[PDB]
Amino acid sequence: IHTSPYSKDAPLVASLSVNQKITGRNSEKDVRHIEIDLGDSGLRYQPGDALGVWYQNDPALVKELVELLWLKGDEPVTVEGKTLPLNEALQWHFELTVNTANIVENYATLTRSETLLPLVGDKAKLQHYAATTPIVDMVRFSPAQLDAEALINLLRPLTPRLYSIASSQAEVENEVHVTVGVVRYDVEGRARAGGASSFLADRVEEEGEVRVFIEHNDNFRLPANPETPVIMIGPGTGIAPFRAFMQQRAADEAPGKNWLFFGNPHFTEDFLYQVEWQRYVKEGVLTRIDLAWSRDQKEKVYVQDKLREQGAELWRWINDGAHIYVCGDANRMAKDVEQALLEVIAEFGGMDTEAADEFLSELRVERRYQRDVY
Numbered sequence: 001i002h003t004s005p006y007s008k009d010a011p012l013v014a015s016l017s018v019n020q021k022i023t024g025r026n027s028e029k030d031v032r033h034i035e036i037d038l039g040d041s042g043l044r045y046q047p048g049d050a051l052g053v054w055y056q057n058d059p060a061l062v063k064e065l066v067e068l069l070w071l072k073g074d075e076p077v078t079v080e081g082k083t084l085p086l087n088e089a090l091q092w093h094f095e096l097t098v099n100t101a102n103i104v105e106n107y108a109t110l111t112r113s114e115t116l117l118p119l120v121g122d123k124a125k126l127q128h129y130a131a132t133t134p135i136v137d138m139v140r141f142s143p144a145q146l147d148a149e150a151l152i153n154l155l156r157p158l159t160p161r162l163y164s165i166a167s168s169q170a171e172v173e174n175e176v177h178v179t180v181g182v183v184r185y186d187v188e189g190r191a192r193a194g195g196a197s198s199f200l201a202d203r204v205e206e207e208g209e210v211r212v213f214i215e216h217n218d219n220f221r222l223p224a225n226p227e228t229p230v231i232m233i234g235p236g237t238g239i240a241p242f243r244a245f246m247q248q249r250a251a252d253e254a255p256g257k258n259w260l261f262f263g264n265p266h267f268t269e270d271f272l273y274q275v276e277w278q279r280y281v282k283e284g285v286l287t288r289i290d291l292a293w294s295r296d297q298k299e300k301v302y303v304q305d306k307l308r309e310q311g312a313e314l315w316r317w318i319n320d321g322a323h324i325y326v327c328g329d330a331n332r333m334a335k336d337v338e339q340a341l342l343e344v345i346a347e348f349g350g351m352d353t354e355a356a357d358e359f360l361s362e363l364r365v366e367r368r369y370q371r372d373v374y
């Protein structure tokens, strides 16, 4: 517009306007619709961008870790040029909620943990213990006396988390919306949680401050040409940019057809933004939707199962020049959705495994196959 001085290390201090649970009362998962006010900042983004969000660790987790280590919490510590009491350094500048094989290995080694040492250099044992046991539970289970400097030396610096933007400024203005699945789990009877998602969910009331920046994604964007059809595949929190896409196309009043593929365990508990979609379908901006409810029956159903069953109509849309978008879990979802997409291109459209491979690839270079997976 004519400048913007906010970025990762110089974030905009914004205001948390809305923090709403969007999953049902008996969902297995807690998902928050969050709206942050951008005020007169002039911060701008496009559908497909992500919002960078700084967080602080739970003060109660910090107190727990420090007392396990025989520390007081005060104790001056130096972090990137600044002398801080232990407690403030841990709350604001160190990751506490992501364990790693190296941390596990250095703690074990540092404290000479009789119970952790057999894992040392044992490779995948280390990675498995770290995926399984948070750092505070690692020292709960094998506590030891540490000095404040030895601790902070073990730890990795705190970094912001990315959330796909769930709004379009064409519709919203002054605001950015995000779709936050909050990471909650227990460890041998203790409640644990992800750092940033529980910070947003639990530790900022309303209109309280959040430190925010835009991570642009120019490789995840609506077609120019409002007449072009778009197919959106976004189970779970992967739905978020597709809420941004529909706000945009509804706002621009794009006549182009829209197809959404969504999946999650339970219709009843986990149909994120479902009134919004039903309205889109009724106002005719959303042309089609296919739902995959994992745990709604005996057999597990996923989006990729709907993509195959919807094969011939999908193919019809591709040849009409559709753009295809995938967002959500990369670890398993993105791969199985890609193979369903190769199966469909072969099945309908003049098969040959190798040629379908080639086709999916020309699509990506043409910008007609785009993904944002994590």
Ligand SMILES: Cc1cc2nc3c(=O)[nH]c(=O)nc-3n(C[C@H](O)[C@H](O)[C@H](O)COP(=O)(O)OP(=O)(O)OC[C@@H]3O[C@@H](n4cnc5c(N)ncnc54)[C@@H](O)[C@@H]3O)c2cc1C
Pocket (backbone or CB within 6 Å): 050, 097, 098, 099, 130, 131, 132, 133, 134, 161, 162, 163, 164, 165, 179, 180, 181, 182, 183, 184, 185, 186, 193, 194, 195, 196, 197, 198, 237, 238, 240, 372, 373, 374
């Ligand atoms: C481009 C981009 C888009 C994203 N968009 C979204 C979005 O729209 N919405 C969204 O929700 N997320 C999205 N994220 C992911 C988000 O960035 C975070 O990674 C996610 O919120 C978790 O952050 P956290 O800080 O809450 O947790 P962290 O503290 O980083 O949590 C780490 C996790 O907590 C623990 N873990 C999980 N469960 C268990 C268990 N049972 N046992 C022990 N260990 C466990 C840690 O091991 C595990 O690795 C996006 C990621 C990227 C890169």
